[PDB]
Design a protein around this ligand. Structure first.
Ligand code: HEA
Ligand code: HEA
Ligand SMILES: CCCCCCCCCCCCCCCCCC(=O)OC[C@H](COP(=O)([O-])OCC[N+](C)(C)C)OC(=O)CCCCCCCCCCCCCCCCC
Ligand SMILES: CCCCCCCCCCCCCCCCCC(=O)OC[C@H](COP(=O)([O-])OCC[N+](C)(C)C)OC(=O)CCCCCCCCCCCCCCCCC
Ligand SMILES: CCCCCCCCCCCCCCCCCC(=O)OC[C@H](COP(=O)([O-])OCC[N+](C)(C)C)OC(=O)CCCCCCCCCCCCCCCCC
Ligand SMILES: CCCCCCCCCCCCCCCCCC(=O)OC[C@H](COP(=O)([O-])OCC[N+](C)(C)C)OC(=O)CCCCCCCCCCCCCCCCC
Ligand SMILES: CCCCCCCCCCCCCCCCCC(=O)OC[C@H](COP(=O)(O)OCCN)OC(=O)CCCCCCCCCCCCCCCCC
Ligand SMILES: CCCCCCCCCCCCCCCCCC(=O)OC[C@H](COP(=O)(O)OCCN)OC(=O)CCCCCCCCCCCCCCCCC
Ligand SMILES: CCCCCCCCCCCCCCCCCC(=O)OC[C@H](COP(=O)(O)OCCN)OC(=O)CCCCCCCCCCCCCCCCC
Ligand SMILES: CCCCCCCCCCCCCCCCCC(=O)OC[C@H](COP(=O)(O)OCCN)OC(=O)CCCCCCCCCCCCCCCCC
Ligand SMILES: CCCCCCCCCCCCCCCCCC(=O)OC[C@H](COP(=O)(O)OCCN)OC(=O)CCCCCCCCCCCCCCCCC
Ligand SMILES: CCCCCCCC/C=C\CCCCCCCC(=O)OC[C@H](O)COP(=O)(O)OC[C@H](N)C(=O)O
Ligand SMILES: [Cu+2]
Ligand SMILES: [Cu+2]
Ligand SMILES: [Cu+2]
Ligand SMILES: [Mg+2]
Ligand SMILES: [Zn+2]
Lengths: 54, 157, 59, 75, 495, 196, 55, 115, 98, 52
């Protein structure tokens, strides 16, 4: 996985503009959303037997 | 009292091409929007401005064609299109595309419009920091253009 | 003399141009393809061992 | 079709026509949603009323539910 | 030559080109479909015959259970999504919005090879290892976790296969959304994009929201098996597992179906020489079906002991989702009218069959929506008839429309219309003889996932036998037709 | 011919109503499609401009709405009708679902050799015209007590005690199934109920 | 039905009135319509005298 | 043979002069505006599908809230920080009718209908 | 020539902030590991214990990934490669806030 | 646009010449092009004769 930072550096130096930056930022947002959903699923797992008081 | 220097943006290549000529590149990548349903209703009942349209030659005549410009390689066929409904009898549901030879008079016999799709190649200085900062003359450019015409040049991909 | 300035111009004026940034570093690419082959071999061996019930350590 | 409810009521008169039409669309969306909810809520409350009526007319003379179901106190 | 061999391998392994990845997705999808069809033929031969003719033991019915589970998984996750979404999604989406490649080019290759590792693990676990998983495609615990016949690492490898398939689908979904949002040519607004693109976008939104929950459920199964926890054991909630799984489950079926609608609309515009009737309505109905599908998941759980108010709510929500599909069907029917669709075209006749079979399947599934009436139809062959007259008679025929349309464009050879007509007609008749009887067998009371049935259900399975023979004929015709497609002439003389 | 319950009678009549509505809609669409196809194949009635009609679209999206509210109301009432008998009973019967046999009040019911797949050696007896409560559960895996001829299908889940109400009116033996994949002997785990 | 917005109608009216005054016609908008319709009338006679071209 | 008729020769169906539909420029358009132009603004096709989406969402939210309000088993007693906990009564169903199971009509029965 | 400059690196705000954040993240990880082993009595093989530990383990994994990101951003900020508008900085900020 | 009747007669003569010498040639060329496209797509290559 060290290949990602290298290609990232050499592509930012050469291939970058606002269209590319917007694409990348939107992808970052979607990834953050996926992580939030993962946490929601695990909280569902945790609180299933706790909200049901009896 | 102190001196501040803002950190410049060092990126070259596509970014420096964009920042050298922001008008042309923005023109290339600027989204424009079409009318919604209520806007179409509000536009279809707007008035003409003057009686010129009854006398002049419309935009898209055999003598006043619609000239459009794409970027690409010399001689490559140009992709152009309508948004539909340039005529009452022409479809308007969706955009209709066209492949046409460059620098030739074409006629759409759906709407009846004459157009001049043509190509301008985006030949630009190799963006590696050696670009010129002051007015340049025709000699070095002459050499580069001669080489491009005779052999071709790489693509910025 | 800013390090970012030097790094950019070196990427353009101090190295042989490679169409692939991973190839801009020769030995790392070697290591990465070696890792790919290693993972292939590991997967094949693990499949062989788990199915047949013998773990290759006794032979 | 969906005529613009705000025009015959004089609402959002300071907005451009596009945004006024957007408000009209929002109002119509609000109306279309409230229909089925109203129908089902009306049916449910009618069912509760009818159950109260039945429990009144069946457990009127009962000795076990003559004061709770008969009177409707805790139907 | 070593150079040529390495060039080919690198061409198909280092690629990040949408067209190449699309054809790879299509090829893998067709292969998985054929494997699933073979397994289904084994299942049908087990059902068609009396006295456990194939397994010959009651102790060996775990073989039949493995068959049903792997058939379900292969046909759902490895056949119809790689073909419906992966193949035409990568090949066409950038082309229709006039761009070069999808955003994040590398993630596309990552997605395809994640699919491949999933298929490899699945096949090696369920073919080359003893006693595979035998719990249906819905891996309900405690059967999946606490069971004598499910103790080997094959079960765990199958669960990890589900994980990798989910990862691949999420990557594809994110890539599709991002590419459609930002990479449209100048002058093309978001809602004027091709209808197939919008269906792909909504499918992607569906996958993003629901897959992490399935990941959590499958990790729960793995932990129960290995860490010996009680998440779903007697001190746990198998109902919790079901809630999570089905929160993923129904969005999955709508993900499967919507791209078929998009493809059908696109191909119709192409082959009838007329625009879609009510394009805006069809797009809005697509998005409405996508959104409504997230609120109905528990209509698969009317018998586990839900609260009565929840049962009422889920029946209501299922009806709500029924509405927009009807709108779409009417739009299709009116689109075909006043057109000039080709009268000798496998695409045209496949569209007819798709429309009819989907309406029938929708009605049968609308019967199941009612909670009360689902008391008599849960876990019978009525449900199998439903989701096979939808999946195997509507989604499949949508992909056949796409197949008989795009082959002359991808390869540049016409299509043998008479041969293809034999294939399609026999596929239609053979399937209708297998699945239709199931409905009346479900009402009569036959249970699903059983290899041996009571003597009262003979006629249904005789008709199924007839249908299975016709299906074998049809699929052989299909594969032979494709082989003949890429082969030059074999006879030639002088007249 | 008797129904053997009133819950099942209600379910059957609701099913019949839905069948009537769906067959009417199917006939209407069949007539429309027949006309369209007959015109199409003969190459008659072609119009490229017919790609929209606002009033038709609004009407055809309104009609399914008003014909589905009736169905939903009827379904909800049928559900609550199924569940209203709870509390009016005087007998409790406990059912345990084991691996390929049932247990009724600590008595084991297993499939018999006298019947192929439908008979067991120990039925479950309930009096006719007598509300009863079944307390169903399982010990190892998920089964499903399925007697749909009396309108009953209750999943027996380990560690989850389900409670259902049963009331038979016709005397005789009712044959049901396990209706949930429990393993190898899933197809040979029937249910027998004697209403006497 | 076409809707046309007459820009600078005051200047247009002034110029039209002066044109009509020069031609010795009434300076009223109806007179302008009558004159423009008289300009284009009588074309059939001129059409009838056109000799056909060679095939 | 009137001037307008002549000027009307280029505005008949046969020889109508073509006219291309125009674009517009929007200085700033976020996703919300996109919606306002994409879905809203077509409120003859978006009306009832959007209504179905809203009805589904509202019904789901209402069901959740109603359950959290009236269901006897559920309780936000161990779910919410202690500062807000004194507003929760988790054992209410076990305390109805003084805890004695001898008189229905004294124990609440939370059903939508036909309780 | 390209030579690392500790003076400029320490006179840069991004390098300091990312290093401090990475240090605090490591402290948090060590503290949370110290309460998982020698503080609690219930293990991951219980009813509440399992759910609680799954939640905190997922959070700890995300914290480890965030620590890696902060270390990478510290490395890039030391070299002077991180600008004000860096999407790397945006991603790390959003991830840490999440 | 012709304004007086003399311009109308001039444009009528021009139209007659153009019709004899520039428009009918265009019409016949286009008709041939359409038939030639049909022939190119005929013979089992494309879907000519399936509708229309
Ligand atoms: C997309 C999903 C999909 C597809 C295509 C199919 C296709 C078929 N399925 Fe099945 N099936 C399921 C999904 C699918 N199935 C699921 C999810 C289950 C439940 C598993 C469970 O119960 O646990 C199931 C269960 C199931 C059973 C359960 C038996 C039992 O439970 O008692 C049976 C038996 O009758 C059956 C039969 C068939 C048959 C005969 C075909 C086909 O032979 C009929 C149509 C054949 C086709 C020709 C399609 C194959 C296509 C190819 C040839 C690839 C070429 C590509 C294209 C044509 C585009 N399926
Ligand atoms: C792509 C596949 C696909 C599609 C599109 C659907 C669509 C629908 N499905 Fe289903 N379904 C499955 C795949 C699919 N399903 C699978 C694989 C299973 C089994 C999972 C498992 O248990 O193994 C399943 C199981 C399943 C069940 C489980 C029954 C049981 O398990 O107890 C139910 C019941 O609620 C259901 C309902 C529906 C409904 C109500 C629709 C609706 O979308 C259909 C709506 C369509 C229409 C209604 C047609 C349009 C009608 C008209 C033209 C107008 C008529 C209108 C009025 C009368 C108002 N599906
Ligand atoms: C930024 C991201 C943060 C992520 C972390 C979590 C954020 C907080 C919000 C999460 C919402 C989604 C997850 C919970 C929903 C599932 C709950 C569940 O198990 O439901 C089944 C249980 C019912 O379980 P049951 O009754 O079927 O059975 C329980 C198990 N047995 C059988 C053993 C008894 O609850 C419900 O169904 C209640 C209705 C659903 C809605 C619940 C809303 C919860 C709101 C919490 C508010 C406080 C939050 C902050 C503290
Ligand atoms: C079954 C569960 C399913 C749900 C799982 C939920 C957890 C999160 C899953 C995330 C996977 C999806 C990622 C979406 C996109 C993220 C942003 C992105 O890719 O940016 C573009 C970039 C790469 O884009 P690129 O190289 O394609 O080019 C884009 C163009 N440039 C580079 C010019 C901007 O992504 C990365 O650099 C990835 C980060 C590197 C380190 C991590 C590698 C992970 C590889 C993915 C598989 C992981 C398997 C475990
Ligand atoms: C592949 C990923 C890398 C390798 C696997 C990592 C995950 C292992 C999970 C099982 C760990 C069991 C264990 O030993 O726990 C010890 C520890 C502690 O166990 P403990 O608490 O029982 O230890 C006893 C402690 N006292 C002294 C108090 C009695 O467990 C955890 O911390 C829980 C971690 C669970 C994993 C959480 C992250 C998410 C997992 C992946 C989800 C993916 C979903 C999307 C796809
Ligand atoms: C884990 C699951 C990851 C899923 C995918 C996440 C996508 C995030 C994408 C972020 C992105 O594109 O950022 C752009 C930014 C770059 O933004 P940029 O495009 O503006 O680039 C500017 C570049 N400079 C600063 C040089 C001018 O890149 C990064 O954030 C770095 C790449 C991602 C992180 C790579 C980590 C490598 C280290 C090893 C990782 C593997 C560890 C293995 C486990 C070890 C356990 C001890
Ligand atoms: C069941 C057993 C297997 C289990 C594990 C596999 C799981 C399922 C499959 C997963 C996907 C595997 C795909 C195939 C990968 C094979 C390796 C490969 O493609 O290597 C390409 C790599 C290219 O190297 P590159 O730096 O691009 O050089 C180009 C020319 N100099 O070149 C190299 O690395 C060197 C040459 C390799 C040639 C192929 C292998 C022989
Ligand atoms: C978020 C989700 C929240 C949870 C969900 C909550 C609930 C959802 C919605 C609830 C409302 C559903 C529909 C309610 C109406 C049906 C109940 C009702 O009105 O019952 C009254 C009546 C009882 O009368 P009964 O006892 O039979 O006779 C006594 C003397 N004759 O009933 C009967 O007679 C019953 C017999 C008929 C049953 C079939 C359907 C009838 C529906 C309407 C009945 C009344 C007719 C009025 C309408 C006019 C029709 C032309
Ligand atoms: C937009 C997407 C919204 C998705 C959620 C929509 C929820 C609609 C309401 C459904 C509902 O109320 O389901 C009830 C169900 C439990 O029902 P049950 O166990 O029968 O009885 C109640 C407790 N005794 O409840 C459950 O099973 C659990 C609670 C509902 C699901 C919670 C989902 C949280 C959000 C997940 C990520 C969504 C991403 C999009
Ligand atoms: C008179 C007919 C019988 C003549 C004698 C028996 C042998 C027949 C030839 C066997 C090989 C099949 C012919 C080659 C071919 O391309 O078959 C395709 C054909 C599909 O079309 P078909 O079913 O022929 O439709 C008209 C009905 N005869 O048929 C099929 O696709 C059928 C499935 C394949 C059958 C061959 C299987 C392997 C070889 C044996
Ligand atoms: C924001 C804060 C949301 C949580 C508030 C909890 C404190 C208030 C409270 O206890 O409300 C009463 C009830 C829970 O009380 P409890 O006795 O546990 O429940 C009765 C049996 N179900 O809870 C309720 O009646 C419903 C509580 C939530 C209602 C608002 C939810 C949305 C909040 C904005 C987003
Ligand atoms: C317009 C677009 C399509 C609309 C959908 C139509 C399609 C047909 C499908 C469905 C029809 C409409 C869908 C909407 C469903 C409406 C049903 C609904 O929420 O009941 C409301 C509920 O009974 C009311 O209970 P309430 O809380 O007042 O009282 C209880 C308790 N005593 C309490 O303490 O309060
Ligand atoms: Cu579903
Ligand atoms: Cu069983
Ligand atoms: Cu069973
Ligand atoms: Mg079941
Ligand atoms: Zn045009």
């Amino acid at each position: 996985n060290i290949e990602w930072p290298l290609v990232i550096i050499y592509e930012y130096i050469y291939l970058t503009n606002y269209n590319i930056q917007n694409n990348l930022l939107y992808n970052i947002a979607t990834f953050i959303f996926l992580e939030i959903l993962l946490f929601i699923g695990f909280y569902w797992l945790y609180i299933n037997n706790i909200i049901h008081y009896p | 009292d102190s001196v501040h220097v803002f950190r410049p943006e060092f990126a070259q290549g596509k970014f420096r091409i964009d920042l050298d000529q922001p008008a042309k590149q923005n023109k290339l990548q600027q989204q424009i929007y079409t009318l919604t349903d209520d806007e179409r209703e509000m536009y279809e009942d707007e008035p003409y401005i003057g009686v010129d349209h009854l006398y002049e030659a419309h935009k898209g005549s055999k003598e006043n064609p619609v000239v459009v410009e794409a970027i690409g390689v010399h001689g490559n066929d140009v992709f152009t299109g309508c948004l539909g409904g340039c005529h009452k009898d022409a479809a308007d549901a969706v955009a209709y595309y066209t492949i046409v030879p460059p620098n030739t008079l074409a006629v759409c016999i759906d709407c009846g419009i004459h157009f001049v799709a043509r190509i301008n190649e985006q030949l630009t200085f190799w963006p590696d920091g050696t670009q010129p900062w002051e007015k340049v003359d025709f000699k070095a450019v002459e050499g580069f253009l001669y080489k491009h015409y005779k052999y071709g040049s790489p693509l910025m991909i | 003399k800013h390090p970012e300035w030097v790094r950019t111009m070196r990427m353009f004026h101090g190295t042989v141009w490679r169409h692939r940034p991973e190839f801009r570093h020769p030995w790392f690419s070697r290591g990465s393809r070696a890792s790919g082959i290693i993972m292939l071999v590991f997967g094949a061996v693990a499949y062989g061992e788990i199915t047949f019930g013998k773990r290759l350590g006794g032979v | 079709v969906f005529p613009s409810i705000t025009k015959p009521l004089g609402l959002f008169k300071n907005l451009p026509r596009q945004h006024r039409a957007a408000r009209d669309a929002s109002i119509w969306l609000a109306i279309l949603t409230a229909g089925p909810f109203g129908i089902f809520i009306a049916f449910k409350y009618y069912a509760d009323w009818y159950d109260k009526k039945l429990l009144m007319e069946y457990y009127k003379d009962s000795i076990v539910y003559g004061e709770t179901y008969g009177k409707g106190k805790y139907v | 030559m070593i150079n040529n061999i390495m060039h080919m391998i690198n061409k198909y392994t280092l690629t990040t080109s949408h067209k190449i990845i699309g054809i790879l997705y299509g090829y893998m999808g067709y292969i998985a479909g054929i494997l699933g069809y073979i397994i289904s033929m084994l299942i049908r031969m087990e059902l068609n015959t009396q006295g456990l003719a194939i397994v010959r033991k009651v102790k060996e019915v775990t073989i039949y259970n493995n068959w049903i589970t792997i058939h379900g998984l292969i046909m759902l996750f490895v056949f119809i999504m790689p073909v419906g979404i992966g193949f035409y999604g990568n090949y066409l989406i950038p082309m229709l919005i006039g761009t070069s490649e999808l955003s994040m080019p590398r993630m596309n290759g990552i997605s395809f090879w994640m699919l491949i590792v999933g298929v490899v693990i699945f096949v090696i676990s369920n073919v080359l290892m003893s006693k595979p998983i035998s719990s249906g495609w819905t891996l309900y615990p405690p059967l999946s976790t606490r069971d004598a016949d499910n103790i080997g690492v094959n079960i765990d490898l199958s669960l990890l296969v589900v994980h990798v398939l989910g990862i691949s689908s999420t990557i594809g979904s994110v890539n599709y959304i991002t590419t459609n949002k930002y990479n449209r040519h100048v002058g093309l607004t978001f809602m004027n994009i091709n209808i197939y693109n919008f269906s792909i976008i909504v499918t992607s939104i569906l996958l993003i929201g629901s897959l992490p929950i399935l990941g959590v459920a499958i990790t729960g199964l793995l932990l129960d098996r290995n860490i010996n926890s009680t998440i779903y054991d007697v001190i746990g909630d198998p109902v919790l597992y079901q809630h999570l799984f089905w929160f993923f489950g129904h969005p999955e079926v709508y993900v499967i179906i919507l791209p078929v609608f998009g493809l059908t609309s696109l191909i119709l515009t192409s082959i009838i020489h007329k625009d879609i009737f009510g394009r805006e309505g069809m797009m809005y109905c697509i998005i409405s079906i996508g959104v409504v599908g997230y609120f109905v998941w528990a209509h698969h759980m009317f018998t586990v002991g839900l609260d009565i108010d929840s049962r009422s709510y889920f029946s209501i929500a299922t009806s709500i989702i029924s509405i927009p599909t009807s709108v779409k069907m009417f739009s299709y029917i009116n689109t075909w009218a006043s057109g000039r669709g080709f009268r000798g075209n496998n695409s045209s006749w496949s569209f007819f069959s798709f429309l009819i079979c989907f309406c029938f399947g929708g009605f049968t599934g609308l019967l199941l929506s009612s909670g009360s009436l689902d008391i008599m139809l849960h876990d019978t062959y009525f449900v199998v008839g439903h989701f096979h007259t939808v999946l195997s008679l509507a989604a499949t025929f949508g992909l056949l429309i796409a197949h008989y349309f795009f082959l002359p464009i991808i390869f540049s050879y016409s299509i043998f219309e008479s041969f293809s007509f034999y294939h399609t007609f026999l596929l239609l008749v053979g399937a209708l003889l297998v699945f239709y009887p199931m409905h009346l067998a479900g009402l009569s009371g036959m249970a699903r996932r059983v290899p041996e049935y009571a003597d009262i259900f003979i006629p249904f399975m005789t008709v199924g036998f007839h249908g299975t023979f016709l299906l074998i004929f049809s699929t052989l015709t299909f594969i032979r037709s494709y082989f003949q497609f890429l082969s030059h002439i074999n006879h030639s003389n002088y007249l | 011919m008797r129904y053997g319950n009133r819950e099942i009678e209600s379910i059957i009549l609701f099913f019949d109503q839905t069948i009537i509505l769906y067959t009417s809609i199917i006939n209407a669409l069949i007539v429309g499609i027949i006309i369209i196809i007959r015109k199409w194949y003969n190459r008659k009635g072609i119009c490229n401009q017919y790609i929209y009609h606002i009033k038709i679209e609004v009407i055809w999206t309104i009609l399914p709405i008003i014909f589905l509210i009736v169905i939903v109301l009827h379904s909800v009432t049928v559900i609550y009708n199924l569940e209203i008998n709870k509390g009016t009973n005087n007998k409790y019967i406990n059912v345990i679902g084991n691996q390929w046999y049932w247990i009724y009040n600590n008595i084991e019911s297993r499939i018999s050799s006298l019947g192929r797949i439908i008979l067991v050696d120990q039925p479950l007896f309930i009096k006719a015209n007598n509300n009863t409560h079944l307390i169903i559960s399982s010990l190892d895996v998920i089964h499903s007590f399925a007697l749909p001829t009396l309108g009953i299908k209750v999943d027996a889940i380990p560690g989850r005690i389900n409670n259902i109400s049963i009331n038979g009116l016709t005397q005789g033996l009712y044959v049901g199934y396990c209706s949930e994949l429990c393993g190898s002997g899933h197809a040979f785990m029937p249910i027998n109920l004697i209403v006497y | 039905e076409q809707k046309i917005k007459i820009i600078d109608s005051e200047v247009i009216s002034f110029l039209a009135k002066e044109i009509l005054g020069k031609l010795g016609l009434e300076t009223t908008p109806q007179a302008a319509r009558q004159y423009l319709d008289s300009l284009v009338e009588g074309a059939e006679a001129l059409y009838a005298k056109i000799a056909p071209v060679e095939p | 043979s009137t001037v307008l008729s002549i000027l009307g020769k280029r505005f008949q169906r046969s020889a109508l002069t073509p006219k291309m539909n125009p674009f517009i420029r929007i200085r700033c358009q976020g996703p919300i505006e996109e919606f306002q132009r994409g879905f809203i603004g077509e409120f003859h096709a978006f009306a009832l599908p959007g209504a179905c989406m809203l009805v589904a969402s509202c019904l789901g939210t209402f069901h959740i809230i109603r359950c959290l309000v009236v269901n006897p088993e559920l309780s936000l007693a161990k779910v919410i920080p202690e500062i807000l906990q004194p507003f929760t009564n988790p054992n209410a169903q076990l305390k109805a009718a003084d805890g004695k199971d001898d008189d229905d009509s004294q124990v609440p029965k939370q059903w939508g209908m036909w309780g | 020539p390209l030579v690392f400059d500790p003076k400029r690196a320490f006179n840069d705000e991004i390098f300091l902030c990312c290093s401090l954040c990475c240090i605090i993240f490591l402290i948090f990880l060590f503290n949370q590991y110290e309460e998982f082993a020698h503080e609690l009595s219930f293990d991951i093989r219980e009813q509440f214990g399992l759910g609680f530990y799954m939640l905190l383990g997922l959070h700890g994994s995300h914290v480890i990934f965030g620590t890696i990101m902060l270390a990478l951003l510290t490395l890039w900020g030391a070299q002077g490669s991180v600008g004000p508008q860096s999407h790397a900085l945006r991603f790390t900020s959003l991830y840490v806030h999440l | 646009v012709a304004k007086d009747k003399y311009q109308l007669a001039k444009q009528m003569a021009e139209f007659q010449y153009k019709k004899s010498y520039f428009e009918k040639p265009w019409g016949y060329m286009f008709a041939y092009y359409c038939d030639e496209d049909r022939a190119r797509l005929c013979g089992g290559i494309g879907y000519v004769g399936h509708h229309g």
